[PDB]
Amino acid sequence: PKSYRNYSKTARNPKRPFEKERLDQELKLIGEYGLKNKREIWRVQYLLAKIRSAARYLLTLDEKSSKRIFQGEALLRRMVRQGLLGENEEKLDYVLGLTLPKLLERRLQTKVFKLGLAKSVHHARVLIRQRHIRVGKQMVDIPSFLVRVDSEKHIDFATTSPFGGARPGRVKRKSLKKQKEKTEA
Amino acid sequence: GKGIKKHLKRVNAPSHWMLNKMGGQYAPKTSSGPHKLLESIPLVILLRNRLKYALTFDEVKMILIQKIVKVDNKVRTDCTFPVGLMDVIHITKSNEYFRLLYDIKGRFVPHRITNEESKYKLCKVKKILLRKGRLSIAVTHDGRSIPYIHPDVKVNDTVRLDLETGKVLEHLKFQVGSLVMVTAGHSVGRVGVISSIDKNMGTYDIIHVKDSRNKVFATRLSNVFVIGDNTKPYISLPREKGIKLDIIEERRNRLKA
Amino acid sequence: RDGRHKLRLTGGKKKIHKKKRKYELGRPPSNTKLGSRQVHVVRGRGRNYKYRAIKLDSGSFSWPTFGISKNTRIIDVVYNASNNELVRTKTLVKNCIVVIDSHPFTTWYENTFGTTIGKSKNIDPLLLEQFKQGRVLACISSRPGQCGKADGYIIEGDELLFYKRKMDKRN
RNA sequence: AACCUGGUUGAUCUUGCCAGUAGUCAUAUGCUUGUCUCAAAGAUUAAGCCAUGCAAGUGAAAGUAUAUAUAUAUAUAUGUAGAAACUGCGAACGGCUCAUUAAAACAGUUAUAGUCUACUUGACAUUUAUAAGGAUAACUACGGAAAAGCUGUAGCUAAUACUUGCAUUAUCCUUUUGGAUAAGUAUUUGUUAGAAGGAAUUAUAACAAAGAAGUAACACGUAAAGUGUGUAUCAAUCGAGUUUCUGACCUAUCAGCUUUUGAUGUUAGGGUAUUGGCCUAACAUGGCUAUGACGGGUAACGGGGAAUUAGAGUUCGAUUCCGGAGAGGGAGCCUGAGAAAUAGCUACCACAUCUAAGGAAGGCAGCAGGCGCGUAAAUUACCCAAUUCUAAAGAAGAGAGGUAGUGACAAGAAAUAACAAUGCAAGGUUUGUAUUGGAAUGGUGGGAAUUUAAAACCUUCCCAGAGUAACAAUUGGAGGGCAAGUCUGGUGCCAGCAGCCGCGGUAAUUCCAGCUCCAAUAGCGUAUAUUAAAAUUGUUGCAGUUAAAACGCUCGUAGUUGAAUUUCAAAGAAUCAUUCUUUUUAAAAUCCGAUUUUGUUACUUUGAGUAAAUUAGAGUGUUCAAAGCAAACAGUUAAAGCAUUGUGUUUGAAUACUAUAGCAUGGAAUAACAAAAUUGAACAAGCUAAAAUUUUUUGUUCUUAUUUUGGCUUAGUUACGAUU
RNA sequence: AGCAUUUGUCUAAAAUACUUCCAUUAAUCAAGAACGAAAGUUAAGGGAGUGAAGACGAUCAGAUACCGUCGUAAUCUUAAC
RNA sequence: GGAAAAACCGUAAAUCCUAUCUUUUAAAGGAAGGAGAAGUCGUAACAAGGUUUCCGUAGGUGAACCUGCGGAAGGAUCAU
RNA sequence: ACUCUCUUAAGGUAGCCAAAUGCCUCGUCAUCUAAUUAGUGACGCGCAUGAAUGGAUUAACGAGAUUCCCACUGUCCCUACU
RNA sequence: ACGCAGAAGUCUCAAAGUGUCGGAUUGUUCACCCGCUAAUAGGGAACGUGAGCUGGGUUUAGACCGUCGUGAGACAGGUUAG
C-alpha cells in the first residue's frame, strides 16, 4: 500500500501574472519584510484566503447556530493566540479586517528586528539562519516562524551561541590570534 | 479460492479501537466468541492500547502466557479473545478488577469495579428458547446460554447475574421508565430513561428515550440495552454516566477546569 | 446449477461471465429400481450427507386411517403422475403409485378389530376387496434419491378413483 | 479571487472563432539541482514471455522415540532432552493484476418463516471390564532407472492413524418410603395436538414406522477431590450462498425482439445445501419493447472517491479501504468446514523445459531481476525488532509486513551571506550605496554521544573548516498581446525566429551573437492529456428579421403543458400599531351534561440506521511548516492525592457531510388523485330465506321449538342528492 | 400552394347576433398521414401564340450569346406521377 | 473387499465444416478534394460591372457559363 | 486545353478495348497457379473500336462459345478379372 | 591434360554397353517456366509411325468482327461451327 501520510500545497500565483500593480506591491512587501520569494507572499495570501473563507462562512451563517458559534469562538481564540487580533477585536468584521503586513509582522525575523536584536529584517533573517536566537529557551533557525502572543516576551539570543558567550565559534581563528600574538611578544 | 478472511487492516478496523494511521499495517482480528467483531475489545487492545501494561504484542504475550489474568473466573492466554460490551476482567497479580463500559466518545473503556462487586454483572437477554421437555434456555448479549430460567423473564429483559454460579440474582422487566444504554445507532454510547414505546408493524421497532438533561430522542429498539431502573442505576457506570454535552458546552467545560 | 447463462427476463441474451463454481451445484438423476437394498452415501457441501438409494424393494407404508406404519415390499410400479416413461422403465419417484403387500396391515387390522388403540370405523368395501386380493395400491411420498428410502401411503376413495382412471375412440 | 486582454477594418460597432492566461496525488520529455525533512514509483504499450533464487509452514505442562544424548535408583529401572518419521492442524488468507463483465457485476436498501457454516464461544447426551482388538509408516536389507519431490520386495512396531465395547432416568401401584413398567438426538415418513412471532407446516406435546451419529479403552498434575486434548445435539460467533427495491457511459446510418433448442406461465417430478426452467415430462401461448426493448460501441471492473469548482456543473476514478472478476485459454475433477483453488491436480488446445532422445518433469498478472514491448518506470539488498498472521501457538516461521538502496513523481522547510569602516549618492549635518577587515555560519572531511533488528539517516557534543565567502544559479524573455532596450555589431523574404498578431526582401529594437534590463527561482521550460476560461451546449443561463439557425404548409398518436371553483375568520396572551404564540367557530362516530377521533399520493418537516481513509472542521508550538494523534503538568534524586512508605496525575484520540431511493415521522398551503345522478343513498316500517341464543324428552351417540343476531325484497321520511 | 367572364348546381368558411346547448371537451405536438408553384417523367388529346433543343442572318477580335427571322420538346386540358 | 479394462447415460475441452456479424489490413488501377508558386486562356461576379440580380428547375456549353420556364428583391422601383 | 493553319466535305464527340475487334504481341501491371502463349480485372498514340453500318449496360432465358472451383469418378497412374 | 591443393571443375580420348523423367502454358515443331534426377545429349528411319489411332490446328460449303474493295467479294487477318 501507499503511505497514508497527508501532504498539501502552500501557494499559487493568480491569473494575469504580469499585473503591474500587483507586482509592484509584492516587490515592496519583499523589500520591507525581508522575504526571499513571491512564494513567501503567496503562502501568507493562502493563510489570509483561508481566514477570508472561514470569515465568509461565519458571517453568512446566522446568530444562534452551533457550528457558527463554535467555529467563530475557536477562530477568534486562535487568532488572539497567534496575535493577529487586537484587544477588543472579537467580532467577524475584524477577522475580515486582517491585512498582509500584519501576518508578516508575526514572523520571527520581523520581531527580532522590532526588538532590536538585529538592525534590519534581512539581518534578523541571517541571524536566525546562523543559529543565534532562542524563543523561550528553544533555538530555532526558521525566519518564517510565526510568533504567538505569549511567546513575544520570551525572545532572546541563544546562550549556546558565541553571542551567548559559551565559546567563540571560530576557536581555530581565536586560537591562531592568541598563539601568534604570544609567539611574537 | 474463497472462504474465511483471517486479516483485518488498520484502516478497515473499527474507529472505536483508536488504531492510528502510521502505527501499523494491520489490526488484530477477533476470535469468534462473546460479542460481535464491531462490538467488542480483544485482550491485546485492552492490555496495550487501553491499559498500557505492555509496549508491544510480545510483551502482551509475556503477560498472557502466565496464569495471572482471569476473565469470568477463567484464565485466558488467548490474544484476540473478545471481551464484549459488559463483563468483569480480574488481573490476579496486580489485584485489579475492571468492568467494561461504553464511553461517551463511542469506544469501550475499562471502568474500575469494587472487589466484592466484581461478583456479578447485569446481563441483557436477546432471545429465550424452549428446548426438549418444554425446558427454557435464555440467550444473552454476550453469547452465553443461561439454562432453566423462570418464565416470568422475557426476551428483552435484563438480569443481574452471578459469575461464580453463572445464574440469576434478580431480573428487571423491560418497560417504560427503565434506565437504558444505547449500544449502536446514531445515539451510541449514551444513557437515558425510556420515555415511551410504540410498536412498529413488520418493520423496525423504535423507542423514545429521555436524557438526564430532560431532552428526548428516538433510538432503534435492537440497540437499546436496559441498564437500570427509575429507582436506581443497577451497575457502576463511569463518572460521565452517558450524559450528552454538546461540543461548545464540553470544550467550555474542559477550559473551565 | 447456474441461471445466469440462461436468457434475460426481456428475452435478451447475456454474455458468459464468472467461471463455474462448486456451489452452484447439481448432479445426475436417481435411477432407483426394484431389487435388494443398496445405497451410496453422497457428500454435500459442509459435510452434509444424502443417501442415494440405487435399489430397494421394501419401504415404509402408512395406513393413514389408523395412522400406523409397517415395512412392506412393493410388488410393482403401476402409475406415475409425472410421465409414462418412469413407470414403464420401473423408476420410483415421490408421485409414483405402486402396489404393496397387504399382509402386515391385514394382520394388524385382524388383531385390532377381531374380524377382516384404534378408530375401528370399518374399511370401505372396494379397498377391503383390494386388501384381500393383495393388489393394494399405494403412493410413494419420500424422495428415495435424497433420503435413501421409498416410503409411502395407502390410497383410498377419490385418490384411488383418480389414479385408477389414470392407470387405465376407446374407453 | 463569481474577473479578462490581443487578432476580420482605411477607421467602426457586432456575430464568431482563434490566441494568450491560470490549475491538474497527470504523464512524458529539455535544461538546471549547494541543501534538509517528506515519499508516487513496468497500469495505460503485450491478461506478452520468463534464466537463477526465494515467496507456507508448524513441537518450551499435556499423541507417537531401543537412531541418539544425559541425572539419579539396584547390565537393568525410573526419568529428562532428541535427528528422523507417522499423526494433527494450516497453506481457501495475503500479495498480484483489471482481460472481462453495461441491468449483469457493483452501490445504497431489503429478505432469507428457502439455507449451510471449521476454528472459537457458552449451553451440554439417547436404542475382556482394575480397561479391549490388530496393522501400517519411518526404520533394517536387497534392488532397479541417463534423470526426476521415480520408486519394487520382505521383516518389523506405535499413536489423539484405524475397529469395537463395559446400567441410568421417567412414568403407574403402594400414601414419604418400598414394588411394577417402559426408554433413538439430528434426519425422514405417515397420523395428530398447538410458548413466541405481523404472519407458523416454528418452539414445543402425543402417536406408528424407519434412522445417522454418538455419549473418553487418550495426556498432564492443586495440601502455605486441579488441568490438557477431543466428542453428538442446541444456541452464539467468524462468515457465506441466494434474494427485494432503487440507481449507469455512448449508440436509431440498430425497431420490433424472445419461443425447434425453456422463451413466458401452470402442473407433476428430478436435481441441489436450499429457493429457483436449476433439470425433465406434460399442458397452456405467452413474455418483453420509445418511460428506447432487442442489438452494436466503449482507450468500460463497480463503489467509497480525485480534479476543477461563486453557484449550478464539467472532467476523472488500473491505482492505499470495500465488493466483484481473473491467475496462458477453455473444461473437468480431487481434498477439505470452506476452493470449480491454479507456488492443488487431470485432459485438450496455445506455449515450453531437461533427455543418454528409451522417457521425464512445467506455468512471475507473488518478490527481486531479465526479455519483448515501447515516449515511459528502482535492488536478484537486510531483517522479522515493530505491525499482524499461520502451528502441537512465548522463544518458530512469514518477499504479508518492516528497514534500507535507487528516486528533481508529487509536498513542506531552506543557502548562495550578514556587519562596521572609509569612498560614493542624494538629503543639511542626516539616510541610501568601489575599496578595505574583524565577528558569525552551515554544506564538505573525521571522531564519539546517540539512534538502530543490525546498519544508515536525524539530532547533540568535540575536532577539522570560506573572502573573488572560485565552497561560482539557472531558465525564458525585453514591438504588441505582456513585466524589460527607438542598446552594439553581423546577416539582407536569405538564414531564420515567433501559441497569436508579426519581424527579415540593405541605415533589423523581433534573426545570429555580445551587452544591459526583466520575471520566476532550486527550480524553470516543452509537449500531450484534462478543468477553468466558456451565459462558445446555456436547469440556473445562449442564439434563430439582416450575422449560424422557424420543419413549404396543416392534421395527429406518443410527449410536455392544461381556467376559476369548495372552511372564511375572530378574540386573548407573549413581544418591537411590528413580531412569536394560545384559545373558539359546523357535523358524525365513541366513552364517563361532559370527556377523544375523521380521505390517498406528490411535495415538505423532523427522525431512525449510517465503515474508515479522504473532505470540511475542533483539540493539540512536529524546533515552525508539510505533518502526526498525540500530549501537557509538578518533583536537584517531593509534596499533594488514597491505602493500612506502597502508590505519579490530568488526560486527548473531537464534531459533521456519510445517495436521490428505501425505512419511520408531523403537515393546514400548493399540486395531483379517489370519492363523483339516463336518476343516487341516508334513515324509519313491514315481509322474507340464513345463522346463533334461550328452551327441551332419549347414558357415554340422539331428534323439535319459541327467541336473538347477521343477509335480502318492498310504500314512507331527510335542510335529502348535480358549481361556473 | 393558390384564386379574377356569365348563370346554375354541389360544397365548405369566418365574423356578427344569442337571458340557445354541451360542461373541460383544451394548447403545442416526435412517430405517421394529408394538401403542396414552376419544371421534369408517362399516356391521350391539342400544338393558337409564346417557345429549353435546334437552325440560319448578323453582331464581334472570337459569339456555340445578347439582337433579328425561323423553329421541333414544352407551355393548355384530361389521366397518372 | 477389490486393481486394470470395457459399456451406458451426463458434463464437455478441442477440432473442422458452414452461416452471420466485428476488426484492422493488403492491392494494380480509378476518380475526388484541398495546399503552393503574383502559371495559360478568357472576362463570369463586384457599379445598370456595360444583357438588374438571385432562387428553384430543365436543356445546352471547352469554360467562366448561356437560354427557357415559374418565383423573390437579398433591385436600380417602398412615387400618379 | 487555348490560338492559328493547310488539305479535304467534315476530320472520331458520348462511350469502349490487346474483346469472336491489337499487325508488332506470348504488349505492360496486378491477381489467379507450384509453373499461366491460358483465365480475370486493369491499362489503351486503337497496324485498322465507336455511336440505328447502331455504341454502352443488363436481370430472365440458352442441346450457345469460353475459364475456374466443389462434388464425383478406371479419364489416368496401370492395368486386372469377368 | 590442366592456369588440376583438397573439394570442385574444365578441355579431351577409347567408347553407343546403359540411361535420358513428373508437370504448368501452347494447335504447335520450336518455345518458355517449375520440380525431381545420375543426366533430364543431339540426331536418322518417306520431316519414323492416318486400311494404327486422334482430328485440336492450315485447308470445302454455314456464321461473326476488323481492314481492304463502288460492287460481287478479297484478306500466307482474327474467330465459332463443321
Topology:
This is part of a larger assembly, with chains A (185 residues), B (257 residues) and C (171 residues).
Chain A: H1 20-33, H2 38-60, H3 66-82, H4 92-97, H5 100-105, H6 108-115, H7 121-129, E1 133-135, E2 138-139, E3 155-157, H8 171-184
Antiparallel strand pairs in A: 1-2, 1-3
Helix pairs in contact in A: 2-3, 6-7
Chain B: E1 8-9, E2 26-27, H1 43-50, H2 57-65, E3 69-71, E4 74-75, E5 88-91, E6 96-102, E7 108-112, E8 120-131, E9 135-140, E10 145-147, E11 158-162, E12 168-172, E13 179-182, E14 190-198, E15 206-210, E16 216-220, E17 224-226, H3 247-255
Antiparallel strand pairs in B: 1-2, 3-4, 3-5, 5-6, 6-7, 8-9, 8-11, 9-10, 11-12, 13-14, 13-17, 14-15, 15-16
Chain C: E1 33-34, E2 38-44, E3 48-56, E4 58-63, E5 68-80, H1 84-89, E6 96-100, H2 103-113, H3 125-133, E7 136-140, H4 144-147, E8 152-154, H5 157-167
Parallel strand pairs in C: 1-3, 4-8
Antiparallel strand pairs in C: 2-3, 4-5, 5-6, 6-7, 7-8
Chain B binds five RNA strands through strand 1, strand 2, helix 2, strand 8 and strand 9.
PDB class: ribosome
Keywords: ribosome
Entry title: Cryo-electron microscopy reconstruction of the Plasmodium falciparum 80S ribosome bound to P/E-tRNA
Any overview of this molecule?
Chain A is mainly alpha-helical. Helices cover 52% and strands 4% of the residues of chain A. Chain A has helices at 20-33, 38-60, 66-82, 92-97, 100-105, 108-115, 121-129, 171-184, and strands at 133-135, 138-139, 155-157. Chain A has a 3-stranded antiparallel sheet with strand order 2-1-3, with no helix packed on it. In chain A, strand 1 and strand 2 form a beta hairpin. In chain A, helix 2 runs antiparallel to helix 3 (66-82). Chain B has 257 residues and is mainly beta. Chain B is built from 3 helices and 17 strands. By secondary structure, chain C is α+β, with helices and mostly antiparallel strands. In chain C, the strands form 2 sheets. A 5-stranded mixed barrel of chain C has the order 4-5-6-7-8. In chain C, strands 1-3-2 form a 3-stranded mixed sheet. In chain C, strand 4 and strand 5 (68-80) form a beta hairpin. Chains A and B meet through helix 3 of A and helix 3 of B. Chain B binds 5 RNA strands through strand 1, strand 2, helix 2, strand 8 and strand 9. Chain A: Residues 169-180 have a biased composition (Basic residues).
